Design a protein around this ligand. Structure first.
Ligand SMILES: [Cu+2]
Ligand SMILES: [Cu+2]
Ligand SMILES: [W+6]
Length: 504
């Protein structure tokens, strides 16, 4: 039993020095430590709120919902910086936990930093972060049933940044450090890679819906693939949402003219944009949706090493509270939820990529070497293709409902002072001139990483059960994998590639 355990963050904290590629010229401070007020850390107790806080889509809020949120942020902004509830203090929380503020001294490892990103800590940490943030906002405006908006980018009209965030500084929800090309009611790109795609809005919307389906169904096949990999004291694959739509939105909003793409483009500065929290409000919602799908494998983590991991936050009373992963899995107990559509289906539920026609494919993926014929590690300074032996062919619906076939891209090594991304295509073999889109069945997804240099070693998982059917290759002994670099890959290597059956 070695769960990650935040220390007394008011006693053990150091300036952020990780994940910031240009510190000598950074727009926000790296002094992200919380105010030390001599408080004793209290244990969490479940809230006694009379009713459930209902978070609302940011593009369809009532007059009261918008006005309160706006009034709450104005109040938080007006607080002294040193106040732990202040706008600046709340932003620094993200910086402290994401950019090397804390050590694992409480677990007996004072020389190792805690990183809550790129692991199974990703979802529960942000859930707790928002929990206290929301309760703090409500107390500032004397609204005990106050609820955050959420950026519903899984809904077409929810996809552009909501106009409540736009205008100028006289709007509390406004932030000057945003990509000026992306704040004019333009549609978010949930698989953004730094380059604006010149495609019709209709197509971008369709692909955004496919991205949600991908993150929650095609690649989010089990707790490891969805939440992220196991992370314990003394020491991690990234999850489908985290390296997918979540990372895209950060890079899409951040200002590319700033040294570290501040604010949303980097973890240390993200919290200075009010939309950061509202984006994460929807990421929090994805966890709930993922469970509501009631598909095999869509279950919560039961590992004691996860359940007993804990963080510390200031609450609405400036008290320090220790919270555990085990206590945030049930929203009803945290006295909040999300206003849903009350319809038969999610708009993205059937956004599985269309089936590929055999008449659109040639016979083979071409002349390409197998893994065993290849010498690893392989440099990704150019497109890379290899055939990977599958554990079996022509599995029945029974076997597919018992085990996912999973593509593992292991030992991804690269300089993580810059945003990195490459894309993964499997069994791409179209006839010349065949019509293509950014969300074709061949596309397995991507590996994207916001800067987190402690140089760094990652792992990515892609589900193939649907894909092999969608591309008519469930009977081929090998899967041809194509890795395609988009940015920050000029020095990236890939140590191992393989496909495994992973029981549900
Ligand atoms: Cu974060
Ligand atoms: Cu984030
Ligand atoms: W158009």
């Amino acid at each position: 039993l070695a769960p990650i355990t935040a220390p007394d963050i008011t006693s053990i904290c150091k300036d952020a020095s990780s994940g910031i590629g240009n510190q000598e010229g950074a727009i926000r401070t790296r002094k992200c430590c919380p105010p030390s007020l001599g408080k004793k850390i209290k244990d969490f107790q479940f809230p006694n709120d009379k009713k459930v806080r209902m978070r609302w889509p940011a593009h369809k809020g009532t007059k009261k919902q918008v006005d309160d949120y706006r009034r709450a942020i104005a109040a938080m902004r007006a607080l002294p910086d040193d106040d732990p509830r202040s706008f600046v203090s709340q932003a620094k929380i993200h910086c402290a936990y994401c950019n090397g503020g804390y050590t694992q001294v409480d677990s007996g490892f004072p020389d190792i930093d805690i990183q809550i990103h790129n692991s199974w800590l990703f979802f529960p940490f942000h859930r707790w972060y928002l929990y206290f943030y929301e309760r703090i906002l409500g107390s500032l405006i004397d609204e005990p049933n106050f609820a955050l908006p959420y950026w519903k980018w899984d809904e077409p009209k929810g996809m552009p940044i909501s106009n409540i965030f736009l205008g100028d500084a006289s709007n509390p929800l406004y932030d000057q450090y945003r990509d000026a090309n992306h704040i004019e009611d333009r549609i978010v790109d949930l698989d953004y890679d730094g380059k604006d795609k010149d495609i019709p809005d209709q197509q971008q919307v369709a692909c955004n819906l496919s991205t949600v389906y991908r993150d929650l169904v095609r690649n989010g096949v089990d707790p490891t693939s969805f939440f992220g990999g196991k992370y314990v004291a003394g020491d991690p694959s990234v999850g489908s949402v985290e390296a997918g739509s979540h990372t895209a939105v950060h890079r899409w909003v951040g200002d590319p003219t700033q040294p570290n793409n501040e604010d949303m483009g980097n973890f240390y500065s993200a919290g200075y944009d009010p939309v950061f929290y509202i984006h994460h409000a929807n990421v929090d919602r994805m966890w709930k949706l993922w469970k509501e799908l009631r598909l095999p494998g869509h279950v919560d983590i039961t590992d004691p090493d996860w359940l007993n991991a804990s963080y510390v936050f200031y609450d609405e009373n400036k008290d320090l509270v220790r919270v555990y992963n085990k206590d945030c899995v049930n929203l009803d107990k945290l006295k909040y939820n999300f206003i849903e559509n009350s319809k038969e289906v999610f708009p993205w539920r059937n956004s599985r990529p269309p089936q590929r026609r055999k008449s659109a494919q040639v016979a083979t993926t071409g002349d390409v070497k197998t893994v065993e014929q290849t010498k690893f590690p392989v440099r990704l300074n150019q497109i890379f293709k290899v055939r990977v032996k599958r554990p079996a062919v022509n599995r029945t619906e029974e076997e597919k409902d018992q085990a996912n076939e999973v593509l593992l891209i292991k030992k991804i090594k690269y300089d993580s002072g810059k945003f990195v991304k490459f894309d993964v295509f499997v069994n791409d073999k179209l006839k010349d001139g065949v019509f293509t889109t950014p969300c074709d069945p061949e596309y397995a997804g991507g590996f994207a990483q916001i800067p987190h240099n402690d140089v760094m070693t990652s792992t990515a998982r892609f589900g193939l059960n649907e894909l092999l059917e969608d591309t008519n290759t469930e009977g081929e002994e090998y899967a041809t994998v194509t890795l395609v670099p988009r940015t920050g890959c000029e020095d990236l290597t890939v140590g191992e590639i393989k496909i495994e059956l992973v029981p549900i």
